[model samples]
Target: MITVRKIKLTIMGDKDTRNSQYKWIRDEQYNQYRALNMGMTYLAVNDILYMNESGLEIRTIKDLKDCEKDIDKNKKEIELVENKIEDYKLKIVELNKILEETQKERMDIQKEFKEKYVDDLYQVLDKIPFKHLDNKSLVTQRIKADIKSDKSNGLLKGERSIRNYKRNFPLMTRGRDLKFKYDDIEIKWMEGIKFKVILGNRIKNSLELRHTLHKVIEGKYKICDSSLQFDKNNNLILNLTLDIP
Candidate 1:
């Protein structure tokens, strides 16, 4: 955003005298002053001014000294605000972990219900007296209660959700059936509680595999566990697990 201001100046006396008074304007080229949002200014604009040239005239020396005190006061306030932000950040991390665990539990319950009762859910509902009732909410509530009671008992059991994910990398080869090498590659953790690498349906286990994985672990790609694989074509692949941070 920008703004423009206009000011009128009044000069007294005859044309020659007024022209003489304002002659300094014609003799000197106009200079642009740097704009300020806050704080005092020195007369120099882009290093063009002489030493100790005419400068700011507003505010007394005592008043300027008081601004230094104001700065010290503001420093304490900013420190307090930063501490509060750090405390709130910790709380958010704690709450986020709890929410993630709760969601996982809820998904487990839903999947278990679908597995055990998907086929029989309608049969059980048909036996209810409200089968003829048009109020769907009441019917839904009754069905929910029935499932909850069954889940609480030993009638149904929950299972952990399925997790199957993999990543693929193109193996670089120099010539047909010859030496192969990967260009200083590093794999990072993504998801899941644990992960392992596979090459052509077999777990990777070799010297190059061990060396590169160790490099990644030491180079800030923190890992709980890691794995590597070699395919029939001599292409290298990696299997990595989630990192702690």
Candidate 2:
């Protein structure tokens, strides 16, 4: 069985840059850009020249994979032999034999580097974000799959592989915006939406499940299926699911 809890928090201020960026991404980018792998997130490297001073880029998973694909397809184009005469055609044919071995060496070099290179591309990319996503690369996949589920009728948005989700109003990247600690979570989704949020000593709901909730926070269980929703009182509350198995 799965347990769901309301991880509630009242935002510090009414409106600011952090809240604005969260709203902007939820409205515009969330539907357009996607995480190819579930838990993948980004950190904005300063002065990357974000379009429109938005402090955001389109480093969607697709673009990274496109880079990998071209990197993977390591074939040399022999343009010199494209349109030569028959006299040298056989000469070029004779040349192919010697050139063939050299080409194999090139293939060896690219192939050997590819194994670790592709994965590093994935890992470093998990630490990076925003670009022309190459979906022929792998995915606008997980969330879209979420929307397709038969029981997904009531789901406003579906997210998988996101570690903390939006509960703490995190930027998903490790730069100037969101920073995590055992006792405090300092977050700034945008320049204005900044908060030195207190990680309270107690859960919002201290029911019979108090021990379990504490355990969840203690990293004893895996967390997923999280969403931040606006309460009737206009407060932001996180609906977080704790899982085992």
Candidate 3:
């Protein structure tokens, strides 16, 4: 059945000087950083409510007994958590307002800064034109997991407690840049596994890292088996499975 996944994200970096242009950069970055966290939260929250409603929807779980009793006991409690998710949803709406206003403010600031600061570094980041991404999809995908996780209480009751998971996902041209932002910096392994599973103990809580694993498990991405390795520089290399079928 469709179930909720809780958003597990620790807000990073204090809000930049209130109303500063950097705030847009930071907010955009935050939105990107917390994108998956929000996705998990939304999924978790939606799933919880979905499962409670009735039939037809199917949810993947490794174990059921583990969370069955909790569901039964927390019928009201579950709804209460769902309400909290609603609040988060509402908050996202509010953040959108701020984000819009901030973007405008950033444009104005860019104009003023351009005139005031000559030493300002104005350069295009990528010579390759960025394809227009569907903001809805990008935002939805980025924040889906986090919001779902937030709603699910970060514990997905499955056949087994998902202590750890490993899977492969293809590197879509759309998401490659994001990988660099979210995953470890890559100075060496340019075209291979960029993470070491053994380091799961260190970054497991990181949604950025975990969602990459999620894509692999879902069989959407392609990764090579036993190809995930690290070099002396501690650089990482792993295979991403592609949805070849």
* Most accurate candidate by TM-score: 2
> Which scores higher on lDDT, 1 or 3?
3
Model 2 scores what on Cα lDDT? 0.41
Q: Kindly give the number of clashing pairs for every candidate.
A: 1, 14, 68
lDDT of 3 by residue, 1-245 (tens): 22222121122233563234333333443333343344344344444443332222122121233344444555566554688667556655655565565556555545555553333222212112222343235444434444455435644455333222112211122334223223323211222323223323354454555565555445565432122222344233333323333
TM-score of every prediction relative to native: 0.17, 0.33, 0.21
Q: For candidate 1, what is the lDDT?
A: 0.33
Error of 2 at 129 (Å): 14
- Sort by TM-score, best first: 2, 3, 1
Kindly indicate the candidate among 1 and 3 with the higher TM-score: 3
The sequence of per-residue lDDT tens digits that candidate 2 reaches over residues 1-245 is: 77666544444555685566457544433423344334233211111112112211123223434544443442222234354445345444544554565456555545545554445433444522443243213333433353345224532233332232332242122122332232344434433444443345555444534455556546676655443445566445545555578
Cα lDDT, all candidates: 0.33, 0.41, 0.37
User: What is the Cα-based TM-score of model 3?
Assistant: 0.21
- Over 4 Å off in model 1, which ranges? 1-79, 118-245
lDDT of 1 at 2: 22
